Design a protein around this ligand. Structure first.
Ligand SMILES: [Zn+2]
Lengths: 50, 49
């Protein structure tokens, strides 16, 4: 935006391919996967006879 | 000792200015985003000192 000799330009993280918070979400997933895979080892797999 | 002598000096003084004209005097914005209501803000003046 340019008015009367003062101008400003901004480029957001928003894009057609990815949303503005997509970086935070994708890092949250990276942590949750590690966090969840490790915790499953505390409980272990499920077994039932047949 | 210097009753009828001349004297000369190299001197340092503070910078000073006066406003001799106000130029592009007012610039305005109705800022509304992330406000309870429309607000009027005066953007910077340019001064010819
Ligand atoms: Zn079990």
């Amino acid at each position: 935006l340019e008015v009367d000799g003062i101008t400003e330009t901004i480029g957001t993280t928003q894009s057609a391919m990815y949303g503005g918070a997509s970086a935070q979400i994708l890092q949250i997933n990276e942590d949750i996967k590690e966090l969840l895979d490790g915790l499953r080892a505390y409980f272990g797999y499920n077994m039932i006879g047949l | 000792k210097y009753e009828n002598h001349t004297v000369t000096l190299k001197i340092l003084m503070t910078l000073r200015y006066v406003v001799s004209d106000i130029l592009k005097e007012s610039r305005y914005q109705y800022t509304k985003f992330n406000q309870p209501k429309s607000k009027f803000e005066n953007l910077p003046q340019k001064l010819l000192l």
